[PDB]
Ligand binder design. Structure first.
Ligand SMILES: *[C@@H]1O[C@H](CO)[C@@H](O[C@@H]2O[C@H](CO)[C@@H](O[C@@H]3O[C@H](CO[C@H]4O[C@H](CO)[C@@H](O)[C@H](O)[C@@H]4O)[C@@H](O)[C@H](O)[C@@H]3O[C@@H]3OC[C@@H](O)[C@H](O)[C@H]3O)[C@H](O)[C@H]2NC(C)=O)[C@H](O)[C@H]1NC(C)=O
Length: 196
């Protein structure tokens, strides 16, 4: 049994600045993944590999919005579901005792719905278009994560760290909060850009 679940939320504006996007970047956080993990070594590609079934209807519409596959065209994304499949096989495979394909993705949607990080940041006077200290961002998120969240940065331009993703950890059963390991990817010697 793994130690915790990490909900990874992507900030679209940043993701589409550091990567090639085929979808318009939503002005809200989206799901990048839900990773069962351990503090020691990274857990991934657990056996046996779980068969992936293509989603349809409501679940499909829900995932296309909340877990938008930014790197692919909408039609291909909805039809072939490349990113959802990859994430399920690489990470979903590590929590098959408590979840199935449907409840794994359902959980991701439920956990995402628990937060409105954009609004939380705003009430802490942190909005897109400016830069802020790592600590200020961290403190704002912890007000809702309860336990330590993981603020992940990317540097599209050397020397300009920016908010790329936010991780929030939960217990394996997703009933309680858990302290996320700190990736220390943000250069705290300088402010962090919150891309508009
Ligand atoms: C940016 O993204 C965030 C997260 O997705 C958006 O916030 C969420 O927005 C949805 C849609 O407006 C909103 O859904 C509504 O939820 C309430 C109940 O919410 C409470 O209970 C949830 C379960 O216990 C819990 O997860 C929440 O955190 C709240 O405590 C329902 O009563 C409403 O009916 C509505 O639910 C939606 O109904 C339509 C259905 O198709 C859909 O699946 C279902 O979700 C969330 O509450 C809200 N979450 C938060 C934390 O506020 C945010 O709005 C986005 N930004 C903008 C500007 O759009």
């Amino acid at each position: 049994d793994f130690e915790y679940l990490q909900l990874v939320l992507t900030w679209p504006a940043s993701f589409c600045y550091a990567n090639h996007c085929e979808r318009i970047a939503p002005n809200n956080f989206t799901i990048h993944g839900l990773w069962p993990d351990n503090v020691k070594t990274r857990l991934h590609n657990c056996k046996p590999k779980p068969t992936y079934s293509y989603f349809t209807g409501k679940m499909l519409n829900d995932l296309d919005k909340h877990w938008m596959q930014l790197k692919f065209e909408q039609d291909y994304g909805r039809t072939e579901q490349p990113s959802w499949k990859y994430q399920y096989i690489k990470h979903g495979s590590c929590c098959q005792k408590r979840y199935n394909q449907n409840t794994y993705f359902g959980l991701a949607l439920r956990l995402k719905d628990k937060f409105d990080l954009l609004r939380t940041l705003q009430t802490h006077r942190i909005i897109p278009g400016s830069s802020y200290t790592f600590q200020d961002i961290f403190d704002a998120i912890k007000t809702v994560s309860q336990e330590n969240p993981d603020i992940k940065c990317a540097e599209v331009t050397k020397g300009t760290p920016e908010l790329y993703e936010i991780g929030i950890c939960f217990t394996p059963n997703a009933d309680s909060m858990f302290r996320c390991p700190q990736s220390d990817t943000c250069d705290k010697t300088a402010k962090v850009l919150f891309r508009r």
